[model samples]
Target chain A: EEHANMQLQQQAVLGLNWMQDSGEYKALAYQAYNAAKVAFDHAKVAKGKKKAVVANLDETMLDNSPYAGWQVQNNKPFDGKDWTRWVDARQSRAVPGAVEFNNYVNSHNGKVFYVTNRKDSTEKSGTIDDMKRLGFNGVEESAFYLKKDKSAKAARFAEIEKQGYEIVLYVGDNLDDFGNTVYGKLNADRRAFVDQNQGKFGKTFIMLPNANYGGWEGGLAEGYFKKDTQGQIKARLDAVQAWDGKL
Target chain B: EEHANMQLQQQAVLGLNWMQDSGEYKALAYQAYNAAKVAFDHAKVAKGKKKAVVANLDETMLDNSPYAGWQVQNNKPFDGKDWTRWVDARQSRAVPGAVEFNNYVNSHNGKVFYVTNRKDSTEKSGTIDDMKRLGFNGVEESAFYLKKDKSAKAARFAEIEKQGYEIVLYVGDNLDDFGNTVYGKLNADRRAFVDQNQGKFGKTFIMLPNANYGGWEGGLAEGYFKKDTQGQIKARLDAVQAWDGKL
Candidate 1:
């Protein structure tokens, strides 16, 4: 409670509460996957192409709020080693409607490929095992495009296309999950990218809500990830848009 | 800044930051409206019924983040008079893609009705005027069923049905915007309601994101709204669903 960094974790309380406990959050998740189902059903591939769906893993199809919960309770900042251990723990839950939509695609003559930043070597078995236990189908090792080096997923997307499957849709909680265009950009460009492709959302780029962590957190400021907790906290505060209490 | 209420406001910073600044939030807005448009298109009414879209006004179609911003900056707790002035200020912005969707429904052989908890008398003109300025085409005063005697919206929803239009879809930032089943209910029942009707979310119960405030906030605890600043703060902290920091 006395830690200076505790305030940072404390700031996340309500958002985490919403994500972990609210029916509204679950509704949003169901809505995203429901739309994904329609988009997938309506999707058509080239004559020679197979239908494929590209989805991000964490907070997209998997529920990783437990880790965020741990962060909140203990005032822990995000760490790679901790995340690796969490992944290895295999406690991930399925997002509402996510497992159903995923299994639907796999059963309905479409394929789902998980394009995630979960470390390829260290996190593979746990991720796959956890997904299977959580009711997601098509978690075969080859169905994954985990991060070996590049964190941006456009290359992995290309790798999917090269396999003669047209990626009919991409789903995730982060804008960065869609492509590499806004991968390292700030929030302005990220929002602009969404503006530019406004029509494609819920159609080609299905979104799941993730109030905890994502590329958007980094998009708050340049050098956000490299900053100390205090700097990160400042960036978050400065990024807030508020009314001036006028009138 | 040294006020004990400051942590309460500070607790909201990341959530407010995400709501007001994230492209992910904008994308979610577009996604919801995009899905709503589809739902409206695919909806069929009974032989004698007209098509109507029931939408909640505030965070669903309008942006009132500046008020939330003011709260964060000043460590101000939510207040009725402050909210009244904020509504009267007519500074409300449109949630991304909301206006277009509103207009589209109105022009495309459908009508969009605003059934909101905004105070019926004093807040009406500002709400309508703001919507008209924000590019919504159907701001006729009669289009709204703002709160008068009750905050539960099922009565207004029935009033819409009494007008002979089948409620093709409903849009809102809260679960209560859909029905009274979860009204004055806790998170467990609210989530159960969502689970019981999961398929309707993206199709008919389109959701927009609002982490700042909503029925879910009250759903955190019985007598939640009755609590003072310190008690309300405790309710929020206790409501957080955190991990045990194991593994």
Candidate 2:
């Protein structure tokens, strides 16, 4: 009882940082919490500059804290909890065909994993917990990888290769996330590369839609994206090719 | 008589690895000679097309044995004799400016190291003995990296960073040798990156002439060098968009 009292007192004084009695769970959680804190702290420096930290996930991300992977950029966190609740509560419809696609992938021997640039300290068992809470099987912490370093692509490749996985596919929204862009931001040539490598999608690479934030919109803030998306869309739609269908 | 016989036997083995053991007056001549013999026998496989090895100095390289390091790579044996006579007979040359530069760095409280990607499994002690004889200092084993890996540039950068070098100047023949690209090999975007970062040269980077061999030749062999040397030179000359001149 005396030793227990001492630990309680220490926990009270040191708060979560001194959860000495607990095993590596608490230790890992503490580490993840601190890492997340630092990442968000850095994210705050990029605020109000059209550089939002978008969480790529279904609406279920808007839910309870246990599985939440909250992110902050520009001094604000996205409305993730609400989205998570909506998805979990089934209040809103699922994204167009994400369900069937997920089902199809799971039907094969393949499995889905969530890889994020989110620092581990900030990510609270986020990907695994979310998958588990969604009733997916084989969803484990080992299945996901949070940000370790800038060479994350090489690390991921090495990890899967060591595991004897051939890596039939890779998916990401940012070019840096793919480990190809060293500029930290994409330029015209990089965009051209993406255009040229379009076949890699479904063949080997899959890029999900991320309209909320990325280097694309960040570049726009830096004046690279001058034409309005809608205007550009309209102009392209208005074009009539020299080969008319009338013939 | 038995002790003298054992000494002669040990000298024979040592002479196989080092070359300074021969000659009438030198007391350690037998030991050096045996070591040289052992060293030369170790490098018999270097004659293969893939293994390209280089020794540092022929003058300081001979030790007391007849000049031996140069003979071993070609699978030759050490010729037992006085090294002074050997150098005179062979017209040995000193390692150009190496000793002075190494001494300068050492005098400034700097550590010196020699690293080659030379394989040791096939080669005998001849190469290593040559290094020792010349007072060349370095780790005697192979390094963690060789020149072939595509990510060798990144690895070298990591090594440099690990050493905590200010790296005021570097002398390398390959574009990767400088942790950047030279001309003719990189894709268009990669070339653009080098162009953008060109001013860092001499201020943060320095390059020495290496016209004999390097990534330049390798790139051409790999068909990454689309333009000829003159064509590349002409393109670069035409590419001088702005100096102190107008934009």
Candidate 3:
């Protein structure tokens, strides 16, 4: 009885279908969401003049699975126009447990600040509307933080903190959501940084699961700065040195 | 008194001072190595008539940090000729615990097979020599599974299984090292695939830590098939949808 037989092999190769179609993904989302809830409850009581829950928008609060799913399913490359179209359509659902946590933050004397990187020039209002349409509580026009200069989120965090609010919980799918300590660090360095800050995980910084795209993948796919997509792809593949089971 | 004050703000933007000078990176490598050793011990006792541990070469067993570190430090893009030059020099060290793990595999009555994606044309003999010189136990000309066909590793794994050897543990940094299930999946799909196989992790598969490069990056930097270097880099950046930290 071979453990991974032909059918199992095919399933393993095509396993994404199982996750997208199955209930397991929801379970994982809820697992992370519930963890955030616990962290939120703890932070809600912590001593501070003001308390706030800072969260990333796409893949953190909202589920843009359809956006990524369509791209992969159709074999089309990603572009800003298409992404804007997806946001304008207001089709994304709430990440499991996001709305409840936001509500909990509001009802518990805490402010839920949505600090997203969505560009103010384009997807700003559309994203706000999408979040509103999905009934994510504690959201307001002023509650949103739009991208101003670049991708680094430190300034946004500072801006929020300057308002005399303690960011009790930093919720995101990407490591950068926690802070810049790991930002721009290569893959190994990023992993090491995470290890160094292990105590903060699940406490002050609650992470949502985002397997689609994030800083984690960006670090692994470095050289995009100097090379083309094909070059980057080759760089990505060339980076892999996995075993073949011959030894 | 913010924990992430001026110092973190600078690091958040500037990132690491390159990996070689970082102690955190080494800690992560050892964490993974120690974990692999523990997994190897557990798998060693699993019911199998013929025991084997399958692994990948670069970054998994051999340290290619210098190769990548040089590229970043010197502002050079990776190319086949340059990579070949690096390999020809045979300067890679054993990953902190790789040699000892290979020795454990042998002493515990298991065979160690290395299935790598390194091309046979340039690296076959050089890789064999490097492994031997580094004192990686059980390495020989026959142990090296050089890439002959396309990049898919499933076929190679099947070949090993067909030889009447039970691969008790599959060890490597890339997800593809475990099987073809994750191979070629888009970034999001790949994440889903890994989620679907959560049970297999640390049981049948003990992954080595490789943050430098892998399929994880390749999926994000897609559509390089027809693009130039700048075009591809644009494509990679365009794929990011990080939150603006608003709302």
Candidate 4:
């Protein structure tokens, strides 16, 4: 019972139950996808330039909730080896509406770039294969932009833009995927940036729901995974805003 | 211009600008107030039981945005002495519709509990006097649930619940005001608890908007006042979830 209680505690901290049972979580995913699709449709009207849609891989294009769920269920802290295995397994499903959105973009003469922060080279290759297997459109090897270091992704975005693509719309769970305005900034700065650029949301940028993990969580911890699992869990718990809501 | 930048940064951190400009924030306050009024109306149907509306003192009833705004405007760190002076002055305006909602509750035979976490003794009395003077119908010295310590307020709530009073609804900006389920928990745990008890929102609980300060911010710092002013500020910046939207 004690062990079971511990698992329950960890699951609560990781929001495994919310991902599994909450209709709100599912609703948010659909809401983000719908917003992205709307943005895509609107961007398609601008006809002169070669267009592209840049997206983050984990939790943005792919649903890695199962991986997070598995970790909590097994009481396993995140490990590079384990994470690599999970990625290589090609088990992550497409985030709700992502495949369809990407396919629509492909059909409309637009390219899709999967700029991910996957650190492992083997896992990066595997994720490319996984995207292809999962029926993601425009899943060429060159479309994948894996992280050499976890620095701000503005350079990666610039690289894609340098290819003469107009970059009509960007899609991601984290704000960094959009541009430097939020990249490498602290949490309040990012929020302020969002406030300043409110018009861009769902128009120039399409955000996907990701409650399980991201740079936001990293910022919440003041960095990532430096403490013990419980300490890390506690920091995350401390990081959320106090508001009365069920989900 | 540098001063303007500082104010902007501070405003972003304290969400002062959001309170001033965001239609969503104003809308949510009215939404919660309206929901509570509806609940209060329905609880009137429960004839024999004495229905009571318990509320937090600061942001729930009074808009202390100026108090927070003052700190940011002057680029001063939070000092207990200055905060006390602000409280004693009784200068906070009524939150959008708080007066009407509480008045409605009073007219409908519901009692009101001004549960607050104000630590200073003088500020406690001054707050009560301010509430009464500010036309809060049920404001009485005995009705105030001032914090004896910065502990979970479940005991204070239990003391009230132990009386014949059936708390039909709770009103607050923070999750802790609702019940012990989320009280004293760290950020993520409190969020998870909110997820678990989402059904209670706008029904048993009517949440007021307060983006400035609370236990949620404290949890972001890992504990209240544990860090220096800049350190606390940075921690809060780090703690926010990454989302692109209006503040």
Q: TM-score, each model?
A: 0.98, 0.27, 0.50, 0.49
Choose the strongest candidate by lDDT.
1
lDDT of 2 by residue, A209-238 (tens): 222233443232233245444432222222
What is candidate 1's lDDT per residue for B1-247, written digit by digit as tens?
A: 2465788888888888888888999999999999999999999999999999999988999899999889888889899789888998999999999989989999999999999989998888888888888889988888999999999999999999999989999999999999899899899999999999999999989999988888898998999999888888888878876666565
Model 4 in CAPRI terms: which quality? incorrect
Docking class of 1: medium
CA lDDT, candidate 3, residue B130:
84
Q: Identify the candidate with maximal DockQ.
A: 1
Off by over 4 Å in 2: A1-96, A221-247, B1-247
Residues B47-131, model 2: lDDT tens digits:
2122111222222222222233233222222222332234334333323234443444445433333322222332224445444
Tens digit of lDDT per residue, candidate 3, span B1-247? 1321211111111112212333333433443445455566765443545777888887678877666545533434446677777777777778655787788888887888888888888877778788889887787666667788767787887777777777877777677787787677666776676567654543455544333345654565555434554553444434544333123
The best-first sequence of candidates by TM-score reads 1, 3, 4, 2
Order the candidates by lDDT, highest first — what do you get? 1, 4, 3, 2
The residue-by-residue lDDT of candidate 3 on A1-247, one tens digit each, is 2321211111111122222332223434444455566666766433555888898887778887666545543434446677877777767778766787788788888888888777877887788888888887766777888777778787888988888888888887677777787777667777777667645654566655443455654565565445644454344444443222122
Interface RMSD of predicted model 1: 1.1
> What Cα-based lDDT does every candidate model obtain?
0.90, 0.31, 0.61, 0.62
* TM-score head-to-head 1 vs 3, winner: 1
Pick the TM-score winner: 1
- How many clashes in each candidate? 1, 48, 30, 8
